[PDB]
Amino acid sequence: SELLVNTKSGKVMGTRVPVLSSHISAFLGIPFAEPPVGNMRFRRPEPKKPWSGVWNASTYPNNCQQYVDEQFPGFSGSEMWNPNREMSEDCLYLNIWVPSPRPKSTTVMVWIYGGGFYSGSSTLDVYNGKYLAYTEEVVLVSLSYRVGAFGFLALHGSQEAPGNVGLLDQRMALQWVHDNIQFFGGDPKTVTIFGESAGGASVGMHILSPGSRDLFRRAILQSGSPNCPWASVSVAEGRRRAVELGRNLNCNLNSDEELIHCLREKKPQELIDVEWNVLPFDSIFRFSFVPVIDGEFFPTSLESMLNSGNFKKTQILLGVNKDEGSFFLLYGAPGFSKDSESKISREDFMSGVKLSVPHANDLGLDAVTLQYTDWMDDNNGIKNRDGLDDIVGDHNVICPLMHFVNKYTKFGNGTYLYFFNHRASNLVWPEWMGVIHGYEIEFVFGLPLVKELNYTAEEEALSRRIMHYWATFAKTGNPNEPHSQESKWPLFTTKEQKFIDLNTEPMKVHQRLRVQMCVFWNQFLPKLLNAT
Amino acid sequence: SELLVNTKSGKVMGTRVPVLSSHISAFLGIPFAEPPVGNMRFRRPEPKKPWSGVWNASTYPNNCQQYVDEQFPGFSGSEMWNPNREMSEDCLYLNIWVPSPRPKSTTVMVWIYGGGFYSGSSTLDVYNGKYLAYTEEVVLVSLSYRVGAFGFLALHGSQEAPGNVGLLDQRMALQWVHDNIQFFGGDPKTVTIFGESAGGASVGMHILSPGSRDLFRRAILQSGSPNCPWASVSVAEGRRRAVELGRNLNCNLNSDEELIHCLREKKPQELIDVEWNVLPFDSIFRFSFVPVIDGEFFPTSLESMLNSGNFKKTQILLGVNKDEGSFFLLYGAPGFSKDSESKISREDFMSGVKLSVPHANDLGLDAVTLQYTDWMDDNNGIKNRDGLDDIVGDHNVICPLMHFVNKYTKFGNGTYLYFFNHRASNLVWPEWMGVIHGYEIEFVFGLPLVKELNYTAEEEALSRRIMHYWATFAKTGNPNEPHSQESKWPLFTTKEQKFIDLNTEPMKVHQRLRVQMCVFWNQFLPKLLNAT
């Protein structure tokens, strides 16, 4: 049967799924690691023990234990990101959408969900890979990994909670795809990993980590990069947060052994209820448990690795959205609201600046304020609002990504940069948020092809154009069709530094994406805070 | 006789002068202090001893000993500023242009020449006040004062060379005008002092100095302010330069007494030949001997006086030119030339930045560079050139003046701000220099009314409009005609901060003159250099 596949771990029974008045195979909930439960909490993942009989891969697996956003109960804009299936520490599974009839050796794309390393699910509606698998004839795989303390609590030195275990879960999945994807018609030698936000940072981290490089061919990073200020913490900071988490749960803190044992006796939701109490500063776009620069998964500092070229050299495609910072300002900055235009007073602007650059002293804060304030009209509430949006977006996503792309392109084998700036006609979020963080995903996964979702024709066209760029790139290392008559997405070079806009209008090529502001965040500000 | 006037110091015989197919009286070279020669060098000025008989005031007096610009021999653009009469330490004289027939009590305007406190002459062609006196029916007076070491060598504590004696020369002249101007038909109670550059800084310094406040009614400052970074030095810095000047002339440096005696035995040109060797840094727009914050002429720091309102409260009219920095870049910055377009490479830009902000450390220099560099086109030689022009102009003239105006307007009784941006059609300097420092003077003195100078009709109109603004202001404290039908120059207020452009087009009102850049120079940069 086409829905039956035998793998090195055992046999799995898929399920026929309808997609755009057609059908393809879907293998949901395939286990790739032993359930990281009990004394295994915080530990490195163990490979899933082979099973006898047939594994029922007809329905989505559980979602990992995580904080659930209840900021707007019933609101689809926020709940579409929440876990849509029961939560459980037993959540290490992956999903595969296979074209019908089953291919023999077609391109493979592996999706790594974002969510600040504190949340995320591979089962979300917006991540359904049947449209991309069907439309582009690729084997679409979506993995899962532990988030929150469960996947990133870090007590470097200890082996019961070394940290980065969530990254290792991802690797374990990539390893499984490498070893078994062939049986589903996929080519293990043409696997492209791609993810957004923390998933984008994850992708970059696998490009950097020696132990992950050989498990994939190419990479796509969407609004995320390994060097993002929120993507990692030092060994010391990780430890401090783990201890503080223990302090929040009335744990014995005499030793890592005692601390870890206590955290392991606590129920999932217990750790999640106090998770946000460990942050060092009052800030936005900062998450408690994230990857740690341990000297193992990451040999040395990310910056020294990028400088020295200590990373996988291949082709990459990446980009950002126009309004990367609007999302987090709405959730934490004073003066922002979901149902108002959120015009920001100068007082709230100042408060917002301090929340956005937590590690900054007075001089630094002044530097930022000056850089983003129009002193000819400093009380303009819209300019203040949009100003904060740019600060949060430039500081947390765009500039870090631009630093990464410029450093990688030095040793890489081909770079393709994009700037996504189209606002969905059916977006349910307020207009002031613009082209929101993560809203390019629905176009990447082909949602605009489903008439019932109420997208416009032009948007359906953009989605198809994007899906084909991603798929053609994964397959060839170039998003463009060899001898095509359509506009060519130029290669990003150290010299020209070209990129394209991704919207519904005819393609346009630009250069030096956000160069002015990124010189400030990547070169000047760091130097200032360090000198002072 | 109309050309004969008896004053408290004695009688003076003027000379009838033709002006625009007409005539007025001119009293040139009237002494107002004893010749500061011999053992009087570096000393405070002594009032001129009354004389018997008639003093021949028919020809211009000598010019004070000063450095002479020979950078472009034969070139009128530079030589029009050089002394046009024999130099001599015996140079303390003033000139008066009196309307004919002699008025009884008309408005008086006193001109204070600029020249960085190291040069200047009251006899220059561009300073001839016959056009302004004739056209506006005002008594025009132009004083003179010692420049260079002669007027500003400062060894605070000593009474033989206390410093600021050049400022006291100006005051002595103002005192003479106060006591005798009435005999020439002038009203001692309606005297407006005005000057450009160092003359503008001088005007502001008399507004600040308790001992000068009562000697005038109003003030006009052209491209100069008391707080300009080049307008003054500390007691310590002044002393260091005096000692260094002595060191350059092989002087005994065992004591102020010995040092001063030596400097006094040296011939004028001897001190002038080594004058520029005392500057502390490699820099442009910096002069060796300038006013000193002594605790006498200036009670406390200029900034504390401005903050506390410790200054004469009256009405003031002031402004700047569009390209204030081009002049000094041509003379000292690498890459600039008089006969080329002076397109600046990035290397020369960097060199130029360091010459413009001498007191800046690396971080500061980076701050400036970032503030004035277009990172989307950083190799554009024209942008680099014009960028340096703005830096030198903003840092040395505009921003200091904006700080002064905003501080004064707080306690003052009326402020009128202008932005002069018209480039003379007959300017002999290269086009890249734009609206050069000091080229608004010829319009202030009415040169465009002399057909032979080859100005355009529109320019003659602007000159008349400017002359009338200045004269109406000196007379009433408001540049506008009471019930006039012409455009009204709005009053500058703390709230609105309005100003006007001064050119040949119809008047336009703007607000926040150069606010963005001045926030950087007046607030941010100072804070940065101080924190680091």
Ligand SMILES: *[C@@H]1O[C@H](CO)[C@@H](O)[C@H](O)[C@H]1NC(C)=O
């Ligand atoms: C990529 O690598 C191939 C072979 O190593 C080389 O021929 C090609 O020039 C490279 N292309 C880029 C964009 O560096």
Ligand SMILES: *[C@@H]1O[C@H](CO)[C@@H](O)[C@H](O)[C@H]1NC(C)=O
């Ligand atoms: C100037 O002073 C007069 C009298 O002291 C006062 O009536 C007037 O309001 C003042 N004007 C300004 C511009 O401050």
Ligand SMILES: *[C@H]1O[C@H](CO)[C@@H](O)[C@H](O)[C@H]1NC(C)=O
């Ligand atoms: C898989 O189990 C059986 C087939 O063995 C199938 O009927 C069922 O729907 C699947 N799982 C569920 C939804 O219980």
Ligand SMILES: *[C@H]1O[C@H](CO)[C@@H](O)[C@H](O)[C@H]1NC(C)=O
């Ligand atoms: C002033 O002196 C006489 C009048 O006493 C006059 O002829 C002469 O021209 C004036 N000074 C000069 C130029 O010698």
Ligand SMILES: *[C@](C)(O)CCC[N+](C)(C)C
């Ligand atoms: C990224 C910080 O990991 C942000 C995740 C955003 N969503 C939209 C995917 C949840």
Ligand SMILES: *[C@](C)(O)CCC[N+](C)(C)C
């Ligand atoms: C000011 C520094 O004192 C510059 C004087 C410029 N001129 C044009 C009047 C000589």
Ligand SMILES: CC(=O)CCC[N+](C)(C)C
């Ligand atoms: C970005 C986030 O959704 C942060 C959510 C807000 N808390 C930190 C308060 C839970």
Ligand SMILES: CC(=O)CCC[N+](C)(C)C
């Ligand atoms: C502004 C000046 O004219 C400076 C002149 C140049 N030297 C300092 C070298 C004499």
